[PDB]
Amino acid sequence: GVQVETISPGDGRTFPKRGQTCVVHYTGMLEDGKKFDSSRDRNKPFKFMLGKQEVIRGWEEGVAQMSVGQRAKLTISPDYAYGATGHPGIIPPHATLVFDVELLKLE
């Protein structure tokens, strides 16, 4: 399902763990390449404890594969995201997500 892909290498070491405050700039675009979200546009770094289940399952799972300082593409499967439900008002149901994640810093 989810198929996170390395873009550019990080430390190659510190993968995300339980309870860590993951910190990433990112953007979010559909399969079509149409965007729906940007971390940077806000210019605010995005922060989330991993395993907290506060996010879509694919984000919760696939970020862990990334290293600190790594840039990576999250081609998250819809089932691991909003899926058939879809994100109301934004993401149409059954749409694979594509994130240009950059793991700034685990915290």
Query: Rg of the chain over CA atoms, in angstroms?
Result: 13
Domain range enclosing 80: 1-107
Q: Is 2 exposed, middle or buried (0-12, 13-18, 19+ CB in 10 A)?
A: buried
* Helical ranges in 1-107 per DSSP H: 39-42, 57-62
CA distance 29 to 12: 26
Per the structure, how many domains does the chain have? Answer: 1
* CATH number of the domain bearing residue 50: 3.10.50.40
Instruction: Kindly provide the resolution of this structure in angstroms, with one decimal.
Output: 3.8
Experimental approach = cryo-EM
Give CA separation, 93 vs 30, 59, 73, in Å.
11, 17, 21
Instruction: Enumerate the active-site residues.
Output: 26, 36-37, 56, 82, 99
